Structure formats: C-alpha cells, structure tokens
Design a protein around this ligand. Structure first.
Ligand SMILES: [Mg+2]
Ligand SMILES: [Mg+2]
Ligand SMILES: [Mg+2]
Ligand SMILES: [Mg+2]
Ligand SMILES: [Mg+2]
Ligand SMILES: [Mg+2]
Ligand SMILES: [Mg+2]
Ligand SMILES: [Mg+2]
Ligand SMILES: [Mg+2]
Ligand SMILES: [Mg+2]
Ligand SMILES: [Mg+2]
Ligand SMILES: [Mg+2]
Ligand SMILES: [Mg+2]
Ligand SMILES: [Mg+2]
Ligand SMILES: [Mg+2]
Lengths: 212, 91, 153, 85, 126, 25, 99
RNA sequence: GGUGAAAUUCUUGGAUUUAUUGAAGACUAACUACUGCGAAAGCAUUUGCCAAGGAUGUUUUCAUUAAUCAGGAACGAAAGUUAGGGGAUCGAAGACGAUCAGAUACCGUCGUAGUCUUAACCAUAAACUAUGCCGAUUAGGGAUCGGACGGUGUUAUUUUUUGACCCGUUCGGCACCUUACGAUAAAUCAAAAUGUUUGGGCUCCUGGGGGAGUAUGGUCGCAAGGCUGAAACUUAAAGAAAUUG
C-alpha cells in the first residue's frame, strides 16, 4: 500500500481570484534525498475559471496554475495559462458565417512572453434575410489588423497580473467589437487561449504580493 | 526613379565622378545622386564636397548598372550632378 | 595547398608593442580583401566576425569553433562545413552546438567562433574523372595514393 | 557554326569517362569558367583564381566564395537570415 | 470535499478508467476493461466498463476522494473521434456508486493537421 | 480480361521484344 | 447512361477538390462527394442524465454536448443505412427529411 | 495492440494509460458552400515584398489592327528517372500471423523505394461537362458571387461620409428550378434548339467487331516510354437507350 507514505498538500490561487483555496493534491513525502519542495515545484493545475470566480458565466474557460513556492501545506501557484473548453469552442463555429482568427505575441513589462489567440465570428443582422453572413477577405484582413493592434497595445501597457485582471471580464473583446463596428460587426469576440513562452528571474516579493 | 527620367528629358544633368566634382566646385550643382556600390572613400568625398556647397544628396538604392539605366544610358554610372531640374520636381 | 578551403591573412594592431600581428584565419563565404574583421565579446554579429558562442543567438551558423577556451580553432574547418548553435544555458555558462557529423555537443559559452560558412563549398560535387586528378589531390597532402587491394596480396 | 550538339564544354574529354560523368562535370565546368559581374564595381570581370577564390580584374579585389560558383545557396540563405534577423 | 479527475479512455477495443490528482502527476487507481473479462472481444463491452468503474469508485473511498471531475477522450488525432461504448457505462456507474461529479469535458485530441491515416486510398476493403 | 492489364501484358511483351532485337543487333 | 446531372458531387467550376478520409473506412474521397453528417447529442445518454444530475454538487450543471462531424464514402453511407437507394423520380428531391 | 474471432507484436527491464517539456518532418481540420480564382493541370494558417489578371465604370485613345488554326511552341495531376538535402506519418516490393481446399489477396504487425524539398527530366490520366473555339437569335423564375446605379429604414463611426442589413435595375460569372413553340433512337438537352423547309466562320477526329494502338520505319527521352502508325488473317454481329420478366 504505497499511499500511507504519501502526504497531501493544498493549492493557493493568486490575485485577483475570489477563491484562494483551489483544491488539494497528493505527493510522496520527504524521506531523505527526495525533497517534496522540488518535487512539486513545476507542477501545473488546470482549473475552471468559473470555480475561482464563483460564477456560472465562466464555465467555459480554464485557468492553468503553476507551483512556484511551498509554505508548509500550501503551494502558492501563479498564473500559467488561459484557455477555452472544447465544448464551447465547437459550439461557436457553426456554418454560414466567417470565422476570423488572429494571433500575436506580447512582452509584458515584467519580462513575460504571452501568445494570445483571439477569435471572432460575424454578426447576423436583426433584419437579415439572406442565409449567409460572410465577409470579404479584404475586410477580414482589415479586421485582423485592428485585432492585432488592439491586443498588442492593450497588453503592452500592463503587467502580468494586470492583464489577468483585464481577462476576467473579457474587457479586451469589448473594444475589438467597438473598433470593428465600422468594418463588419462581430459576435463572441474572445481570447481563445493564452500561452506563456518564457519567464523572468524567479521572484518572491512579486509572488507574495499576489497572495497577500 | 521616374523623376530622373523627366529631368534627363528636359533639364541638364552631369554623369560621372570627375565631372560631378567639377560641378560641385563651381557651386552650380543642386542635387547629387550616389550609387549604392560606389567606393566608400569616393562616397565620403562626394558627401564632404556637398556639405561645403550646401548641396542636397540622394543615395540611390541601386548599383552603377541600375543608376545608368535610370538615366536611359547604356553605360554604368556611379554618381550624378543635377544642374537644372528642368520641368521636374526632384527638388 | 592540400586544404580545399581558402585562407585569409588578417592584420591586427598589437595593443602593447606598436606592431602589426599577422594571423591567418579560415575565410568564410562572403569575405573580401579590405574587409574589417571584429573579434571580441562585443563584436557585431556579421559574417567574418569572431564572437564567443555565449553572445550569439540560437539557430545561427558559425565555423572554426573551439572545444576548449584558448584552443584556437578545432571544429568546422573544411570547405562547406559549419557548426550550428542549438541552445544556451547561461546558469553555468555552457552552449549546446551541433557538429557537421550530426552529433550534438556541449562546449563552454566562452568558446569562440567565426560567423558564417567556410568558403569553397561544393568542392566534392565534381568528379575527378582521372587518375591524375586524384594523384595531384593527394600529392600535396601525403603519400597515401594509390591503394592496392589487400585481397590481391 | 554551333560546333557539337550535346557535349558542349565537356567535348574536351573525348569518348571517355562515361556519358553520365561527363554531364555531371559540365554542370560545374561552365560555372567554373564563366565571367561574373563584380558586386563592388559592376564590371563583368570576376573569374575564379583558385578553388573558393574569385578575383575581379578591374577592382583588384579578391572574394571568397563557393568552389565552382561565386556564391552558394547555403551562404545566400545564411546571409539573408542575418539581415532579416 | 476532495476533488479528483477521472480520465476515461473509451476506444472500440478497450476502456480505461483512470483517476489522478488535479495535475495528473499522481495516479490513484487505474483498471481497464480487459482486467474484468476473459475474452478479448469483451474488453470494450459496456458491462466490462461498468465493472472497472466500480472498483475505481470502491478504491477512491479509502483515500477519501469524494468528488470527481470527468474527462472523456477517444482514440483521437490520427484516428476516430467517437468514444466507445465504455464511456457511457463509466459515467453511469460513478454517478451511482457514491461519487459527486464535478466538471465534465471532452478531451479527445483534435488534430489541425491530420497526418496520413492508415488504410487508404481504398481504405479497409471489408 | 481488364483492358488496364491487357495493356500491361502487351507493354511487358513489347519490352521483351526490344531486348531480343538488341541481342541480335 | 448518365445517372445524375451533377455526376456524384458538387464541383462544377472548381476543377479539383482536396480529398478526405472516410470515418469508418479511411477511404480517400473528395470532400464535396463525401456524405457529411453533423451530429449534436448530449455527452450523456438520456437514460443516464438523471443520475448525473443526482451527483451534481453543484446541482445547476448542464451536461455539455458532443459536436461531431461524420464524413462517409458512398459505400459506407449506404451500408450504414445513412442514405438509401431512391427511385428514378425521387432521386432529384434535394430536401432534407422532415421532422 | 488488433479483429467477425484471433494471432504475430510490446510488457514487472513498468508495456498501455497520466502530466510537463523538447526534437523532427509532414499537413493546414472544424469555418468549407449545387461559393471563389486560374488557359488547363490545379489553388485553403498569418505577415511583407515582387509581377500579373478578369469584371465593372468611362462623353479617354488607335481605327479593322479580327476569328480559327496544318506543321511550330509554353505550361501540364499522380506515378516514374538523375544528383544532393530530408526522412515524422503512411506505405508498392519483402517478411511474418490469421482465413481458406489453396490465399503469391482482401484482414493484422513490421517494413524498403516512394511520400517532402532544390536543380534537371518525363508529357501521360475516366487530363470528363465523356459536350472544340468565335458570333446572332429564341420560354418563364428565384437564389448566389463581383462591380455599378436608384430608393428606403435601422445599426457603428461621423464638421453626416463610409461599412452591415433591406428593395429594385443593369453588366459580367458559377450553377439551378418548371415547360416544350423545338431536338434526339431514347435517356435527356436553353442547348445536344434555330437542319430533308438540309449553307454564319475556322480547326480536329470517325467509317461493323477484332487483329491493334500491335508490327515496322522515323523522331523525342538517361530509362520507363511518348508522338506518328499498318497489313496479313478472322468474324455476323459487336454496340447505344429504353421495355417486360
Ligand atoms: Mg598475386
Ligand atoms: Mg481533374
Ligand atoms: Mg508507465
Ligand atoms: Mg471565397
Ligand atoms: Mg485553417
Ligand atoms: Mg487591376
Ligand atoms: Mg489521351
Ligand atoms: Mg475525351
Ligand atoms: Mg451563343
Ligand atoms: Mg446575377
Ligand atoms: Mg451586387
Ligand atoms: Mg463565377
Ligand atoms: Mg464503312
Ligand atoms: Mg473499324
Ligand atoms: Mg444495355
């Protein structure tokens, strides 16, 4: 029975998540030459944004958390990546409408690379009679230029945590729709995925500032 | 490019290095075109002469082969002096 | 003679003695007489410059790489051969390179190298066609041609 | 008067060495002996001095390049990468 | 209320019920359909998937696992994208054996590239 | 017989015919 | 005899269309010629929906729906009874079956 | 793993499964359509550069400069060839395990050439709309793509312009639906109509079925082969579309 020799820890969410206790975990205990501190350092937890924010409108998003420090029986995890769920993404495509995908890579002020995948779909007019809602390729390229410009400019003037605070209400998608009303109106403008490429020198004051 | 085709049609230009310096010394030159692959010592000499004469310099993004073609000539040209702009707006 | 890749004699200034130090590098495809060659940690990343491997981004192409700091040139010195920088590891100062044979290797990040590809590439793509051309090829290298077959002895 | 039909420069080898080897060699014999345009003065006076060395008769400027061509595809691809990078 | 994740492999040849921690690094119990039948053809049977699900559900009690997030995947990627019959049996058994069910998601690997699948051009002439 | 492989059989037979002629030539 | 006006596909004016793989045969068939079904069904069967709602904790959870696009060749669709042989006059009716 | 069921195969050296990361090469899913571009073959991630193209609008210019084309030339899927690079997946040949009377097959595990790329060949496809190119006329109808025009009302911006949606007109396309004043042997066709009431212009091909796209000669190709292309002899049918069993 190789489970009496395994201890249980906890998961601590960073700011600005409403719920800080994400959940529990399991690992081998310290037994000499096998430290628990470096065995958990680097683990990735994929949890729903809905649970963290205690909302039912975020059920289709997931937040990845990365263990960076261990404080007794609690692992202070930091943000590792935002992404959708498979169920929501397949429901969003549909037919007879144009799908627009834009991608960019932004470097935050705290030496973080983030690749942001932005997704959008055309809007069916209230009085529309024709079946299809396609956009011309010139409009699509014009839309993509507006999307990339907004994503790059919006995330460049903020830190990593500030960007997460921006992602929670999906505020960035609001101005993308606003800027593209005069080109072609859109729906379900979101950030499909957020992926980090590298990290800066590991810090504790910034890490603890989120948990305190 | 196309502007250079108009000035050779109407205005007065000077092709070559030895005659471009002669134009610069007289002070009547007002524009200098320098090819991309001119010898760097010659390039620096032409720029220094223009600074003495307060003459504008354009660095043509092309070799002697392309610069000579732009003038309509069938020989390579490394530098130019535009004495009269003619009916062109290169100035 | 006997090499297959051209050499370039580069002249530097002695920083102590008021003298010109002649030195023969291995020329890269693109070098020319009258070119200025910069060697050092702070040298710009252009063809023909000699830089430490730690100050050169991954994916580049270098030649005359040295295994050990001070061993003035060991790897990638034939006609069309070159060394590719695969990745870095600045925690202890070590650089992972890829050799012409296809083997990966880890060397010091302070090891030097010349940006570019050695000159004379494609040399072995032309048939010699003649016993003379093989004879003259080896006559300036060493006495190893021709080889009698051992099974005929 | 358009001497020969197929061999071209490889007609100096007679009926020797095999047809395929004479085709493989003329691919580089034509490039080896051709005159190229100097990139420093524009004159068509660049010829191979020795293997990997190409000299311009007018500039008196020596260039290091490929064995049978002034530049190799690898060098050009390598050189364009640095400029864009 | 301790949460776990139950990664369920449902192919047409066999079924996997696999519970791990929130990260997947530590696995608790892992039993398959082929561990509960005597014939190879029954490895993917709905009955076998149910029997495997119960023993996983039984085993999770000792560690105190009370709630399970469920991830369902098929032999996706360079293959089919439809879960086998074992997926349904596992879901029903866990929901009845005394487990709280959290988030349910499909995690079948979807290729945007789809390298050359086996069989073509004429596929499986059956 | 399929015309695709009647063509293949004849084409194979033609190749053998040319070898027999080269042998005599 | 020409059996169908559109031959067997929809590529009039398209020249060439990249092929796809059959869902249960792996047959290499053109995308427009293939027989495509978009299926939207609950990820849990209707019989077992109630038990999933019982285990809901967290009792307002809505079971997600699987979103499949099945592509078949002619042989598989006919053998799988997705499509059936129709009469000479009934072949021309391009209307989906009513509900 | 895999199958109708199995077995070859991997596995306590931890197979399969779980998570993270890296490398390699290929490809570009869902969006994707009786939609678009291209002479055809073909063409689906983003960005920049380079050159090109049709339609539209025109109270711009030239003024017959045009149509089709024997020989002649450019491009030409896949497979295949030569020389390098690459080689993930799949997979001719080959080796096994099944099934079977046999199984040199369908099925399963491996697996070489190939599949990818640069330089050079090859020039054939059910290369099909089995329907040559130009031009005129002839029944209705609604969708859809690109452009233009007129009108109307919402929506975003706006020193009231532009985009999306709505209605209509017209030019040019991909097609489609009903009908026969017509056509065909019929299936069917807005062209396969305007043809015994038989003549708008041009090019190519066919003359019962085989032998046969074979033999030979020529020419092109590294080769595989391509283009051109018979005759002896044999035979009363072969064949097309529909009809009832
Ligand atoms: Mg002897
Ligand atoms: Mg075709
Ligand atoms: Mg394992
Ligand atoms: Mg389109
Ligand atoms: Mg795509
Ligand atoms: Mg245009
Ligand atoms: Mg033909
Ligand atoms: Mg035909
Ligand atoms: Mg007409
Ligand atoms: Mg229209
Ligand atoms: Mg319109
Ligand atoms: Mg069209
Ligand atoms: Mg006759
Ligand atoms: Mg006949
Ligand atoms: Mg019949």
């Amino acid at each position: 029975d190789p489970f009496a020799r395994k201890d249980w820890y906890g998961i601590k969410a960073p700011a600005p998540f409403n719920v800080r206790d994400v959940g529990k975990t399991l690992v081998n205990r310290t037994t000499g030459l096998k430290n628990a501190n470096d065995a958990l350092k680097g683990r990735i937890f994929e949890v729903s944004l809905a649970d963290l924010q205690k909302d039912e409108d975020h059920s289709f998003r997931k937040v990845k958390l990365r263990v960076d420090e261990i404080q007794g029986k609690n692992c202070l995890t930091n943000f590792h990546g935002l992404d959708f769920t498979s169920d929501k993404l397949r429901s969003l495509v549909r037919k007879w409408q144009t799908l627009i995908e834009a991608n960019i890579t932004v470097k935050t002020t705290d030496d973080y690379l983030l690749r942001l995948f932005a997704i959008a779909f055309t809007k069916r007019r209230p009085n529309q009679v024709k079946k299809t809602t396609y956009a011309a390729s010139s409009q699509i390229r014009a839309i993509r230029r507006k999307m990339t410009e907004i994503i790059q400019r919006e995330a460049s003037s903020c830190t990593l945590t500030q960007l997460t605070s921006k992602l929670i209400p999906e505020v960035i998608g609001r101005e993308i729709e606003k800027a593209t009303q005069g080109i072609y109106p859109l729906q379900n403008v979101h950030i499909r995925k957020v992926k980090l490429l590298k990290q800066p020198k590991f810090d504790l004051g910034a890490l603890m500032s989120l948990h305190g | 490019g196309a502007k250079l085709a108009l000035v050779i049609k109407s205005g007065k230009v000077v092709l070559g290095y030895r005659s471009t310096l002669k134009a610069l010394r007289s002070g009547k030159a007002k524009l200098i075109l320098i090819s991309a692959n001119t010898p760097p010592l010659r390039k620096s000499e032409l720029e220094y002469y223009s600074m003495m004469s307060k003459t504008a310099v354009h660095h043509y993004t092309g070799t002697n082969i392309e610069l000579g073609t732009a003038c309509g000539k069938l020989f390579r040209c490394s530098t130019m002096a535009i004495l009269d702009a003619g009916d062109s707006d290169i100035l | 003679p006997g090499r297959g890749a051209p050499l370039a004699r580069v002249v530097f200034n002695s920083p102590y003695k008021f003298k010109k130090q002649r030195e023969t590098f291995i020329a890269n495809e693109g070098m020319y007489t009258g070119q200025f060659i910069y060697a050092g940690k702070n040298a710009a990343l252009t063809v023909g410059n000699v830089l430490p491997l730690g100050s050169v981004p991954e994916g580049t192409v270098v030649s005359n790489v040295e295994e050990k700091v001070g061993d003035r040139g060991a790897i990638g010195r034939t006609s069309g051969n070159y060394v590719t920088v695969v990745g870095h590891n600045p925690e202890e100062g070590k650089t992972r390179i890829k050799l012409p044979s296809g083997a990966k290797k880890v060397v010091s990040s302070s090891a030097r190298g010349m940006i570019g590809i050695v000159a004379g590439g494609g040399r072995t793509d032309k048939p010699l066609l003649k016993a003379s051309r093989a004879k003259h090829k080896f006559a300036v290298k060493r006495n190893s041609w021709p080889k009698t077959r051992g099974v005929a002895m | 008067s358009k001497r020969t039909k197929k061999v071209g420069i490889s007609g100096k080898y007679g009926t020797r060495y095999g047809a395929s080897l004479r085709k493989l060699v003329k691919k580089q014999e034509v490039s080896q002996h051709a005159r190229y345009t100097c990139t420093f003065c524009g004159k068509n006076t660049v010829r191979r001095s020795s293997v990997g060395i190409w000299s311009c008769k007018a500039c008196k400027k020596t260039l290091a390049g490929g064995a049978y061509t002034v530049s190799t595809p690898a060098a050009a691809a390598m050189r364009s990468t640095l400029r864009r990078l | 209320l301790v949460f776990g994740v139950a990664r369920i492999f449902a192919s047409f040849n066999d079924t996997f019920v696999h519970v791990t921690d929130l990260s997947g690094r530590e696995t608790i119990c892992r039993v398959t359909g082929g561990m509960k039948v005597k014939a190879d053809r029954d490895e993917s049977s709905p009955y076998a998937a149910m029997l495997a699900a119960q023993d996983v559900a039984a085993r999770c009690k000792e560690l105190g696992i009370t709630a399970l997030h469920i991830k369902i995947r098929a032999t996706g990627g360079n293959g089919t994208k439809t879960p086998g019959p074992g997926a349904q049996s596992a879901l029903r058994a866990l929901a009845r054996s005394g487990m709280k069910i959290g988030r349910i998601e499909d995690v079948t690997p979807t290729p945007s590239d789809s390298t050359r699948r086996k069989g073509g051009r004429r596929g499986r002439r059956l | 017989m399929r015309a695709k492989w009647r063509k293949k059989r004849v084409r194979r037979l033609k190749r053998k015919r040319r070898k027999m002629r080269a042998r005599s030539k | 005899v020409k059996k169908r006006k559109n031959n067997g596909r929809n590529k009039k004016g398209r020249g060439h269309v990249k092929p796809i793989r059959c869902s249960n045969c792996s047959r290499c068939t053109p995308k427009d010629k293939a027989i495509k079904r978009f299926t939207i069904r609950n990820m849990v069967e209707s019989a077992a929906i109630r038990d999933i709602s019982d285990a809901s904790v967290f009792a307002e959870y809505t079971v997600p729906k699987m979103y499949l696009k099945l592509q078949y060749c002619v042989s598989c669709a006919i053998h799988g009874k997705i499509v059936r042989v129709r009469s000479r006059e009934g072949r021309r009716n391009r209307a989906p079956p009513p509900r």
